[PDB]
Write a protein that binds this ligand. Structure first.
Ligand code: HEM
Ligand SMILES: *P(=O)(O)OCC(C)(C)[C@@H](O)C(=O)NCCC(=O)NCCSC(=O)c1c[nH]cn1
Lengths: 411, 75
């Protein structure tokens, strides 16, 4: 169903994204109301909605008139702030942000991650091949959920025994498998992660291993060590960041291939590069739909004024569908060039795990390309529920194997 | 109001330490005193260790006051 009128659309309600096709809604916003004021709903204030690609990157990079320090997503932005302000990278601006980023960039750069990228390829292939042999399976549970989290946990140094439990917490933190979920369950789930990492960071401060937590525990910003609080809070943003969005990207690539078999064939027969395909997968599945800022001063955009203290929401999914930037936006085209999408954001806060995000998608595409002829949906998939994220909980598929290629892998 | 237990007294000291405050009401809500997430984490993890009792976070959310937490640690 494709809604026609702007006024009766509540972007804060997760139900909106389940039971509506918002393509016309965003098109109308892009064309006639590029800066739109969403009304207040209940206690939540109203907020600006930005839908044009040009505007979206313009404000992504203006960390001078706009700030992440009072929330960067709706659940904190509408609440009036974020507890982790000035401590968690995502909700920190200024010199503390610059320093804390340069500390983390030392273990998330392409240089540092090359040992890990090899391990992703290995683990990814195994999971894909074993799902091909099985034929019928759930791709989300049996393949997708198994890579992003395990990769970040290998990096952070989370013991294997605990990962299954952390996975359960992430599924309730900002998204939900249950359509009717209260803010309380979300609150508890988020806080149980902090509780877990309080204890783990404690162990590593006393007995340091070689992992990424230990690197943070041995690092300094402006000549002073990091608080156990600061480290814990960034471990949260890494365990959650390194998981959901990549997971949802991978699942969506498969679901999109069943709908677009012409494109699947281009990949399978090596008529398009993995580099080029990965980017379209990312543009297509824009898992994080929105991110946001607060105004610190007054701004003039499109002849309207954003007052200091107003929430500004930037809509990645709309920006990735802007006709003025992408020729035939709603075409899934693996050869799309140029493909300067904004799935990873833009500017100072550009996604830390961008290289790792691509890596995980890149690997999946390489594995599917080699050891699979095609696949088919065997029963209706379940969506997650969120006003921030978009993707699938489970995806039942039948995977048609490449017996020739699979047999050679057994060596 | 004054604390009435070793427990209430000790719990109130933990509240004061965590909320970076003093003279914290014994029946005051933890959130209404301006209580946020990482505070609550430090709070719950300390109560768990000092009283050697497994305190589920959910039960803390229901009864987030010095008075109520005392009863729960007891019963
Ligand atoms: C394809 C999957 C991913 C998507 C769609 C995505 C999306 C984004 C976006 C749009 C931002 C900017 C947010 C803002 O401006 O406030 C961001 C930042 C961030 N992302 Fe990702 N990301 C992905 C993968 C990852 C991974 C694998 C990690 C794990 C390391 C990660 C960790 C982070 C962190 C720590 C930030 C904050 C950076 C800063 O504030 O400077 N992301 N992500
Ligand atoms: P309490 O006072 O309720 O707060 C908990 C916490 C400290 C966690 C707080 O900051 C909060 O509520 N944050 C909102 C949840 C959040 O923003 N999580 C991280 C977003 S996922 C993300 O940024 C990303 C980037 N790439 C992939 N994922």
């Amino acid at each position: 169903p494709i809604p026609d009128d702007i006024s009766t659309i509540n972007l804060t309600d997760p139900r909106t994204y389940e039971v509506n096709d918002l393509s016309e809604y965003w098109r109308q916003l892009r064309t006639t109301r590029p800066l739109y004021w969403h009304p207040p709903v209940g206690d939540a204030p109203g907020f600006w909605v930005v839908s044009r690609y040009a505007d979206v990157m313009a404000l992504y990079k203006d960390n001078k008139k706009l700030t992440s320090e009072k929330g960067n997503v709706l659940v904190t932005l509408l609440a009036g702030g974020d507890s982790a302000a000035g401590k968690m990278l995502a909700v920190t601006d200024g010199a503390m942000h610059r320093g804390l980023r340069n500390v983390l960039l030392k273990s998330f750069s392409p240089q540092a991650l090359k040992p890990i990228v090899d391990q992703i390829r290995v683990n990814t292939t195994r999971l894909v091949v074993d799902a091909a042999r099985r034929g019928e399976c759930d791709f989300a549970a049996d393949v997708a959920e198994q890579i992003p989290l395990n990769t970040i946990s290998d990096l952070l140094g989370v013991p294997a025994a605990d990962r299954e439990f952390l996975l359960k917490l992430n599924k309730s933190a900002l998204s939900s498998e249950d359509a009717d979920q209260s803010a309380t369950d979300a609150w508890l789930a988020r806080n149980e992660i902090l509780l877990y990492f309080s204890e783990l960071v404690a162990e590593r401060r006393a007995k340091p291993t070689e992992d990424v937590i230990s690197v943070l525990a041995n690092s300094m910003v402006d000549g002073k060590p990091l608080t156990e609080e600061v480290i814990v809070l960034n471990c949260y943003s890494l365990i959650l960041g390194g998981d959901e969005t990549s997971r949802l990207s991978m699942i969506d690539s498969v679901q999109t291939f069943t709908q677009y078999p012409d494109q699947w064939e281009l990949l399978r027969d090596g008529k398009v590069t993995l580099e080029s395909a990965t980017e379209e997968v990312l543009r297509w599945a824009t898992p994080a739909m929105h991110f946001g800022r607060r105004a610190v001063t007054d701004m003039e955009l499109h002849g309207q004024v954003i007052a200091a203290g107003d929430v500004v929401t930037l809509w990645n999914n709309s920006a990735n569908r802007d006709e003025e930037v992408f020729a035939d936006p709603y075409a899934f085209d693996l050869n799309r060039s140029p493909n300067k999408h904004i799935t990873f954001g833009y500017g100072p806060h550009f996604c830390l795990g961008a290289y790792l995000g691509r890596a995980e998608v890149h690997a999946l595409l390489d594995a599917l390309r080699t050891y699979t002829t095609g696949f088919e949906i065997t029963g209706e998939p379940q969506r997650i529920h969120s006003n921030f994220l978009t993707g699938l909980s489970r995806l039942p598929v039948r995977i048609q194997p490449n017996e020739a290629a699979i047999a050679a892998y057994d060596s | 109001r004054e604390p009435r237990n070793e427990t209430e007294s000790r719990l109130r000291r933990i509240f004061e330490e965590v909320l970076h405050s003093e003279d914290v009401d014994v029946e005051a809500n933890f959130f209404e005193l301006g209580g946020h997430s990482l505070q609550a984490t430090k709070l719950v993890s300390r109560i768990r260790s000092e009283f050697d009792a497994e305190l589920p976070l959910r039960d803390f959310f229901e009864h987030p006051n010095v008075a109520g937490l005392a009863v729960l640690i007891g019963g």
